[PDB]
């Protein structure tokens, strides 16, 4: 008759997520600014920062037998959809960069790490920031595959299916592409030198495996909505991970971001 104690304690977690994370979600774009000083949304941070909302929504959905705890489950689930869709629009507004990066894996043609949290536009230019972060698109691609597998309908059109498919080729060459990485500074020196970080190589391998024969439309999908991943690039990332580890790169003996890979 009354709500289960799990629902009651999730309210304290709902307050914690709302007061800390979900109160900063942009009304229009669904994106999350890093802070009040840094009013922009990072692709990697936004994906990571939405996990609490996604976990809470899954936690609330476990007991969805009443109108209210169905609705807060719906809010948390669709707030995650809003952010992942909002982050999709940021990258889909840079399809020219995705197309160019597939053939020429250059930093000048990489998806921007930070976007306008209010309009899903590029705040900074292609050279004003360390933009090539293959572990930021991969953290999006991995969780996009995982959130669809959990039932969250993020991809809405077959054109976005093509975009995500083209994003696979964007992160395919992570084993052979140097990038600034999880810390947006490249090598240990912090001198604009991109390096092969195990975080980017590892993240792409997981994202590629996550997207491997994945129906972006969920169960109510078809072969048109399936992302096809080639295990050549997946296991090539392994050959690099085995060789790199326990090091994060040739310049780093270790990085704590490898916890995001191992």
């Amino acid at each position: 008759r009354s709500r289960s104690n799990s629902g009651v304690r999730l309210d304290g977690y709902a307050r914690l997520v709302q007061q800390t994370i979900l109160c900063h979600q942009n009304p229009v774009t669904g994106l999350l600014p890093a802070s009040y000083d840094q009013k922009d949304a990072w692709v990697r941070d936004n994906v990571y920062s939405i996990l609490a909302v996604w976990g809470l929504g899954l936690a609330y959905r476990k007991n969805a037998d009443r109108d209210e705890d169905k609705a807060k489950a719906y809010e948390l689930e669709q707030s995650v959809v809003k952010l992942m869709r909002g982050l999709l629009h940021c990258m889909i507004r840079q399809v020219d960069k995705v197309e160019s990066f597939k053939y020429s894996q250059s930093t000048k043609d990489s998806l921007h790490a930070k976007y306008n949290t209010k309009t899903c536009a590029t705040v900074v230019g292609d050279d004003q920031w360390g933009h090539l972060q293959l572990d930021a698109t991969s953290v999006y691609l991995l969780f996009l595959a995982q959130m669809t597998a959990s039932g969250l309908h993020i991809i809405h059109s077959l054109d976005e299916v093509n975009f995500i498919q083209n994003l696979v080729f964007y992160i395919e060459a992570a084993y052979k592409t140097a990038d600034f990485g999880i810390w947006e500074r490249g090598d240990k020196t912090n001198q604009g030198i991109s390096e092969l970080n195990a975080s980017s190589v590892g993240m792409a391998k997981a994202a590629l495996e996550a997207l491997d024969e994945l129906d972006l439309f969920g169960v109510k999908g078809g072969p048109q909505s399936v992302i096809h991943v080639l295990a050549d690039e997946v296991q090539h990332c392994q050959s690099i991970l085995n060789s790199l580890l326990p090091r994060a790169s040739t310049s780093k003996e270790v990085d704590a971001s490898l916890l995001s890979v191992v």
Binding site: V28, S79, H156, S157, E160, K220
Partner: protein, 1033 residues
Amino acid sequence: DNETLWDKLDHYYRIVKSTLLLYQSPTTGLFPTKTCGGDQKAKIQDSLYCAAGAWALALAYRRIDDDKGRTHELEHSAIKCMRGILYCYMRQADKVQQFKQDPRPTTCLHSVFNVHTGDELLSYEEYGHLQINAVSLYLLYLVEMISSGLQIIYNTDEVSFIQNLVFCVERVYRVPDFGVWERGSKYNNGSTELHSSSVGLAKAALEAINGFNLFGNQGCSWSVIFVDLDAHNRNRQTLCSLLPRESRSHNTDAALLPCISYPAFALDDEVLFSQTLDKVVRKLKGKYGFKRFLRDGYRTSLEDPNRCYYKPAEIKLFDGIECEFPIFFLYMMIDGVFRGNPKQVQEYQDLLTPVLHHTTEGYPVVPKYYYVPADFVEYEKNNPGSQKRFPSNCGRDGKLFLWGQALYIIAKLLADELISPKDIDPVQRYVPLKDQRNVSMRFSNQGPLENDLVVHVALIAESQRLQVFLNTYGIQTQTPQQVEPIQIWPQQELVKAYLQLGINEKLGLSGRPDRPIGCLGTSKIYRILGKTVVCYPIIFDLSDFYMSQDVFLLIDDIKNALQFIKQYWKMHGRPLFLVLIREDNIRGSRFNPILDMLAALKKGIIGGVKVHVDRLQTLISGAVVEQLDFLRISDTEELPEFKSFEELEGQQPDVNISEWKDKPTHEILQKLNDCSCLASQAILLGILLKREGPNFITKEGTVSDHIERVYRRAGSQKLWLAVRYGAAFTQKFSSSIAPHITTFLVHGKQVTLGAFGHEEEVISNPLSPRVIQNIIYYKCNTHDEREAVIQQELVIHIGWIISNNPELFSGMLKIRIGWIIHAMEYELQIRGGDKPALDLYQLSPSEVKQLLLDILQPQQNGRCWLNRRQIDGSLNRTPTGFYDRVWQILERTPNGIIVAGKHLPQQPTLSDMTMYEMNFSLLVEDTLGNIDQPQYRQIVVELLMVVSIVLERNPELEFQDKVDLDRLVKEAFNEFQKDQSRLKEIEKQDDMTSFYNTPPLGKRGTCSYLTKAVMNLLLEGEVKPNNDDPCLI
């Protein structure tokens, strides 16, 4: 036909994927207007219908279990478009906040967006963005897709924005807009004008979205959208008044089908529906499509593409060559499927097939419009509908009309019965003749034709001393303390409670605007913060104005409020009408009128409205309670308890206005102490606020509040002079005047607010309370401040009559206030005899209404005919259809009409407008305006009637020269003298009196001499041999 349903749906899938879904923006989800050309324009109206087309095919594919992922692709193609409009709209949340507070063409939501970014594309100067059809259709379709199962709204933050969109739609009844055709009218002046389609779509949007959970099945009490019934009701009153006309300029428009049929179905009265359908079918249907409106020059051969606005004379060249839009064959096709008429579906299908074009792959292309070429314009004008038209969009060119292509999918899927009418109408916008039990949609429990609504009337006395003392006269009442856990509120406290609804500090949205809640809103039972609150009607508020203090008007306000609720309450529960009685209503002779009304309520019937008098606890037990949950979801459980109603525990002015105003000495302050009358005080305090600053100190206190005390205190005595000065010198303005004016002009009636012989301001278009407040006090009247108070007195009074007795002002096209206040002030002179007559500012507001009603009567009984022509003339009352007869006159006078130095020519008058048109009716009074004597006006208005009698029944005669009616009035004049001089030789010369007193119909009446005057000049012309009755000789 052994085809499997997969192959039938695959047929439309290819069309949908290649003709409209191929162009959906990956970023914003919007559909560009121009498929080829690189244009960034994405119209909300067009994008909304494109979302419906993918949604419609998704509903069809819902019948295929092995959909191969096409249901998800088409369902979420609609969601992608629906959320993109939301993305564009929420990026303009600062404009939504502005449009809520002050609806204006320069503060509205944009209707055109960049298809690739969602940015603002065109400014208010380049494009007319005020298109309520876009916002209303968005709200309507948002309800439709969410009801069908499409999840568009993702969080309460979006729910707050949708609530603010509803607020922007509530006020639309007073907001002129550019309409669907982003043009406003035929004249293309860039002038916003009230459209039936836009207001009707707002009515459709408000009905579907009221109490609608934006989360769908995954929803709770904090996602339901609240809709103000009364702003919806005033939106419907506008729609019913404007119809069967689209607007002031348009007698009919093709936009009516989207309004009165799919997707809106905004008309709930089957008589009007039919009337409005035929004018579209008759005056706009064509072989190649439907014409948007008569004399529509959009994309015509006679249109200058560079110019964005049409000349006043350019609309003439647009007759017969209007572009025909095939999209409305589809709209009629959807109408046929919805309404169960298969002949209509087949008939309009047989018309689309010739006009349909096809791509290289055979996919149907619906052209946007079919235009007559420049080589064939003049043949078309002579014989309309006989010359070939070329398609705007043909396919194979790259240019596709996505709105037409999307609407093709919806109609064909319905025609082949692949989607049911209820599938695209999950919230039932179309209801069959089984029209019962739909909230907000005129279908109460009784149905569409019976309206014996019972209103729950709760008798509330302000104090126990009133409670027991009324009880001693057989009336049972309860003080608020007697109804204790329940809270009786002023309607303002409900507005203060409603201020928290829809607030988003993240979007900068401030909640529901501070606007009074009317009778229907206060008729609801509210539960706020765990307290059940019932608000008494605003008619019992003693703050807005002082005619609520007049007991007779309050009695009539109580009566007409009940009739207003009887007519416009269409919810599940029975309305609650709390009657508040104050001690001022009982004290004095005001008991006898108040007691009979209360006895009638106790008897069970008042004003013909069935009422139920019972305790408030009885009338609250099982009624539906409006849960103001937004006041608790924000955790404002400690919000200040809104102040509920608290129980309470003789000569004519000896000082003339000119006597002391002319007096230069300032000793009048001592004269204030010297005199003892309230009116003398009410004038002395007024100059003190002007002569000695706004907030000077007096014996009682500050000037500002001392006049307020006098105004409050003067009303208690019912010394009406002081209460009229008291309200005038404080610039008092009740909230009802501005909506009352808007009610006037939506009935076709221009309003002028100013005293006789001074500056009068014509209210052509609906105006906000702010400007009308500036209008009624600052610019209009400055000779006397009490002119505004008397000006506002009638506006409510005419607002009272225009609804109860609409026929009473028939012919009176211009309600001119000061001209009307002349009619009462001149009537007082007439009734005053050779005695000092009554002053219009001495009469109680009841006598102001009664005398106004007396001087309005269809035919004053038995009065001097001179005086009748004075009462009708002063009101500018014209016969029914009088303005029409002026056409038949002007149609047959080549050189026109000249009267009092004002000339009405045959051209360009006949060429510019139509003879049901409102503009011509305004033109006559402008030509008729120079006649100073109201009695002289009527004899001319009489003459224009009789010459119309001569012209209609005698088509052979036609005037040669200009018809100078003053001469005809003068010519028929002397014949009256020489006839009456032969009778008794009246020595009065150039006196209209004898000529005015004689009745028209009689032995020697006015129209007899007027008839002779016409024929003498009418027989001065060549007769035309007529073939209708070939002359036997």
